[PDB]
């Protein structure tokens, strides 16, 4: 029920001149927006990406970002000159802005900034501040960014007002797409493990949504505690892939099944016998 909205930005600076900035947006585990360096405008990846904003409201908002992207590039370039020769290219900056949605009219907006893959700066209250672990040289950049009263007021409005308003629209507009149910398909296989006389049975599960799923190897009605399931790997069509592995002895795969429960199945659990 608690959906998290994320606006991920990735900025690469190779030298003084060359730089590119790319962005994506996620509502839960669904991409809502894309914005390539090539493109001058933000691309919708869903039909409901505009949400409950009018066309005029979106244009004002898009232009705001269009200005930011140009200004961000130059600011960073100038901040490097300011610190130099303390820090130098190549540089990779990452932003992770967004707002978690809680039931009622409750939310928590955030704007996290990372420098060379290390979370260093955030926007908190009405100003930029560093976090524990951040170098001390960042203090001058922070001092400069906090001097810009206009940027502060704009970001405050963006986090406090715009983010929760906008996302509340998305959840309504893309309700059916968020609450969609897709059935997993399963199939079995085996490979030799590190051990000499040991097999490793694998239970594949693919094409299910949402992410929550239950997969276990079973002997009759006895849970095999050896079962080790891997990571949730994505599919192209916005569904999930998962495999569960169980280490066994060779010639001891008789009466071993893989049970799979999922919300979309609705009672009728999948069972595949070896």
């Amino acid at each position, epitope marked *: 029920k608690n959906y998290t909205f994320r606006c991920l930005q990735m900025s690469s600076f190779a030298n003084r001149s060359w730089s590119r900035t790319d962005s994506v947006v996620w509502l839960g585990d669904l991409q809502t927006h894309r914005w390539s360096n090539d493109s001058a405008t933000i691309s919708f990846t869903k039909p409901w990406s505009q949400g409950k904003l009018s066309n005029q409201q979106w244009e004002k908002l898009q232009h705001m970002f269009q200005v930011y992207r140009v200004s961000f590039t130059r600011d960073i370039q100038e901040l490097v000159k*300011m610190m130099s020769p303390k820090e130098d290219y190549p540089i990779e900056i990452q932003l992770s802005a967004g707002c978690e949605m809680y039931p009622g009219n409750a939310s928590e907006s955030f704007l996290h900034v990372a420098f060379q893959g290390k979370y260093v700066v955030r926007f908190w209250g009405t100003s930029w501040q560093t976090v524990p672990g951040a170098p001390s040289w960042l203090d001058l950049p922070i001092k400069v960014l906090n001097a810009d009263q206009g940027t502060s007021a704009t970001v405050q409005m963006l986090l406090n007002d715009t983010c929760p308003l906008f996302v509340r629209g998305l959840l309504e507009a893309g309700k059916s797409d968020l609450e969609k149910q897709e059935k997993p398909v399963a199939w079995l296989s085996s490979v030799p493990s590190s051990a000499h006389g040991h097999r490793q049975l694998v239970c594949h599960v693919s094409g299910f949504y949402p992410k929550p799923v239950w997969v276990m190897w079973m002997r009759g009605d006895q849970e095999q505690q050896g079962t080790h399931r891997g990571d949730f790997l994505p599919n192209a069509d916005e569904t999930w892939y998962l495999q569960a592995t169980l280490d066994v002895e060779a010639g001891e795969e008789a009466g071993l099944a893989c049970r799979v429960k999922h919300s979309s199945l609705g009672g009728q659990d999948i069972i595949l016998y070896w």
Partner: T-cell receptor, first 112, second 114 residues
């Protein structure tokens, strides 16, 4: 309160000669700037500095070399003076804020 | 060609009369706008600075306005005196910090007949 001083205030030079425009500032401002004014144009940035040791290229840096030996001084050096550099040169300073406090100006005439 | 254009280029007014100076720009973004006053062979005396979307300012006889939507700014001078004889420069800063660059106009040569 935040005053900035330039020297020389008025200068005559010949083509090929060295000209050194200086700019002292006792405000402890990290950032200092160099502009030139020409009738028909606005003030255009030549060089600027973010601190002692640092010098950066402006809009029209060609023909000029900058030098920031300390927080206070920031010099614009014309290594090989030319008639095209006949102008009024303004120096400025400022902290992290947008405000740039300008100096009184420096007239330069480069004769043949 | 330039990002800041002023109008008129020059004008002549008799002492006691009013005059309005224009300033249009294409600078983006536009944090603030400042009006300078440059007497013959002198420095840059700041008159006022405008920051808001629809800002209004005053400095005795001097007063100015700014519309960021139109990217337009005026400088009204009530009861021109002899000392107003100067060049009036329009400046636009694209940031609210030292990161910003200042975009200068050519100016407006005012001549007050005593």
């Amino acid at each position: 309160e935040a005053a900035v001083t330039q020297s020389p205030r008025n200068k005559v030079a010949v083509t090929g000669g060295k000209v050194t425009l200086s700019c002292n500032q006792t405000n402890n401002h990290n950032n200092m700037y160099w502009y030139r004014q020409d009738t028909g144009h606005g003030l255009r940035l030549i060089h600027y500095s973010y601190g002692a040791g640092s010098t950066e290229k402006g809009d029209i840096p060609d023909g000029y070399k900058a030098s920031r030996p300390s927080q206070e001084n920031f010099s614009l050096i014309l290594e090989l003076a030319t008639p095209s550099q006949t102008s009024v040169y303004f120096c400025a300073s400022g902290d992290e804020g947008y405000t740039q406090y300008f100096g009184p100006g420096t007239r330069l005439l480069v004769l043949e | 060609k330039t990002q800041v254009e002023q109008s008129p280029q020059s004008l002549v007014v008799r002492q006691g009369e009013n005059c309005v100076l224009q300033c249009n720009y294409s600078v983006t973004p536009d944090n603030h706008l400042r009006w300078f006053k440059q007497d013959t062979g002198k420095g840059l005396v700041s008159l006022t600075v405008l920051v808001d979307q629809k800002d209004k300012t005053s400095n005795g006889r001097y007063s100015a306005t700014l519309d960021k939507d139109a990217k337009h700014s005026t400088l009204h001078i009530t009861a021109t005196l002899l000392d107003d004889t100067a060049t009036y420069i329009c400046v636009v800063g694209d940031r609210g910090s030292a990161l910003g660059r200042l975009h200068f106009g050519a100016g407006t040569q005012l001549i007050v007949i005593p």
